[model samples]
Target: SNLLPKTFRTKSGKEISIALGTGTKWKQAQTINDVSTELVDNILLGLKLGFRHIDTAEAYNTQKEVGEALKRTDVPREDIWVTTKYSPGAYSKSPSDSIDKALAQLGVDYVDLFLIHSPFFTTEQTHGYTLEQAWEALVEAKKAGKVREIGISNAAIPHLEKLFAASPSPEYYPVVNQIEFHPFLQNQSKNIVRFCQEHGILVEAFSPLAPLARVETNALAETLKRLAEKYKKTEAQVLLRYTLQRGILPVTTSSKESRLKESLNLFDFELTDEEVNEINKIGDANPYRAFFHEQFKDL
Candidate 1:
């Protein structure tokens, strides 16, 4: 029990593990083989090693593998939190129908959380329904006990505000906003995080290692290196902690058991107020994004 307490109570009063093990490719550009046995093994190892939260998206195509791992694990169904998404462009019109597919894929009756994968519902439609229709169906699914929570990913202020502004008025506001976050993209998320915080929606960082994993920008590395040395932890650990300290849940993963174990060893040390502010300063200056450029480029 020496590890930092992993449970975070959302504004709605549901407790979730603060750190998440992302399924399959996560924020990578493309996954070569989505259903590889190694993917299932990775998820199974994550579950066995104390990662209580697992994140998968329909687009990620890892839900079936995640389901396999869930079936094999000894963890009780209630003890684990599973999150899956319904891409707006996916074939099904009913959010409940989408939930049923995800449930079938994950071999579960209910998902802990469900999200609309993007704000650009304009890119495509499901059985002639728009975001509004999709959202209402999602709310109904929650009422129907198909999903315990409903939220969105890669959404900004306008997207969230408009949902609230819809004609019928939503039964529930989005309770979570999952996005690619790291020191470099911190500036881009400034307003989005602020809005979520004000509205009681928990924020989750999907690609929490964007600076290191995707781009490896040298300028960002210098700051991470300095802070890593100061805290006596790895640069990746510093990055993850930085995300956590800001009250954003981090969804991250690795293939190595040692690395996965190392990830949770983050709660013991903390960054000072100055350190946190400084990281934001460095992040604001660096300005890089690893996902969803096309959806956001217009504005």
Candidate 2:
């Protein structure tokens, strides 16, 4: 419990913040990996460590675990921000249907933020709805009060433009775009962050620690090590701070309690403009994309 919770307002004035991501990539449903019933404890631990924001998705198959964690925590419902996503498979039936399913799984009346997990899936993957039809369903969910805010994930500029052009009204635009972003994967959209900022859309960066996790012997790592020593911070902290300075909400996760606490200790230091710019160049030198690369490689 070091860094105070920071907030960012959306286009509609709805606010969010950097979160302790609860994505169960390798973990099984209702369990944090092989440890049965560990997700609840992990989430509670995060809350106790001053993390008020929790991000999850139906595709991760841990919504029910998150719901149980929320129920077990003493934290007030209003104090915690919960974000969940629906995949294209769910959108096939109806985005609203997915919303209903997510709410039920999370054991909540409403979610603070709901996101479409992807822009497009393989032909066999999408249930039956087109992207436009799915987006319209999300808009309807927002109107029905099932979700406080709505957005997209793993989407590029063209994907966003198509949605905006086909959307019934501009008022129902996405409030955020969740993407895999880090010093190594800076070209996720070739300046999509700038575009999102211009359109009043907040960019939520998933895997903010990818550079540290994936790049150990590259220019990025060298920069991170030098800066970490200069600032007396870990390479992870330097990377996270860089994203924060760029106005991105970084969703980070850790199973270890010590690392979880370390992740939140990001407010003590500030990165200089020059230092940030130096780190920015690491993306160009060793460009890498960790998640959804195969699906979006061409884009």
Candidate 3:
């Protein structure tokens, strides 16, 4: 609550803004070790490089590092947006306790937003709390001021609707939904985006870049590349500009300082309508979602 970003006016007179997440090497570092220092350094560097928003989670165990970086920086906490999430297992056992641990690690009294990390639930590690139970706990955290707003991640339309209907009151409706999104995945669905916007919930993109392989075929890449060549910018900058122009907040993770710097340079240029439409064509083959595996059929 104390750490939430101030409301900003959008073109339509609505109050909303994009959010940035902290760097996560531990995620990729799961296959490799000793990358924590680089990740932490990149996070601090990101804050200094004009990123006023940040995201962290219990799974990364990076809360302490994020907190330490915040303490050392001269930026006012109120000016920064911080988001964190609770793992399904922790929500099952005692959601409030999980929030407590996160606050302890963040070294703050509250975060801007708190989310349910995943849709699935576990009985072994968690004390039998279902996804619905976890959601209720998140709302409680919001009411208690542990988090100013609440959201969900890795969730589908059905899951999001069920939660909204359950809440009933408009005041408790979810502010956003975090999901895997890229030119090749969930973003391909125009209907889903429309539905979310209709209900006042914004979508936060996780994997905004599918990879370099994806960039070659991306329509935005070709148009941006020509401009990038003219402006002398990296391909990633072009790719990020494509997403930002579309109004979805892309959460790209990079531990290297150079990559972080590239991400910050996105504000230097503007994309034309033709350029955005060009990028839109890369994923015209709607069913090409990368995360659509057999186990995720329900989503």
| Best-performing candidate as measured by lDDT | 2
lDDT for each residue of candidate 3 in 98-137, tens digit (9 for 90 to 100): 7898888788888877888766666455576666676777
175-226 per-residue lDDT for model 1 (tens digits): 8888877877763444777768777778888888878776456666888899
Tens digits of lDDT, candidate 2, 66-156: 8888888887777778899987754335566778888887888888889889986643565666777778888888888888787899888
Taken over the whole model, the C-alpha lDDT of each candidate is 0.76, 0.78, 0.67
Question: What is the model-wide C-alpha lDDT for candidate 3?
Answer: 0.67
Instruction: Identify the superior model by lDDT, candidate 2 or candidate 3.
Output: 2
Sort order, TM-score high to low: 2, 1, 3
| All candidates in order of lDDT, best leading | 2, 1, 3
On the 0 to 100 scale, the lDDT of residue 162 in model 2 is 71
Pairs of colliding residues, candidate 2: none
> In terms of TM-score, how similar is model 1 to the real structure?
0.87
Task: Provide the lowest-lDDT 10-residue window in model 2.
Answer: 1-10
Candidate 1 clash total?
0
Scanning candidate 3 in windows of ten residues, the lowest lDDT window is 1-10
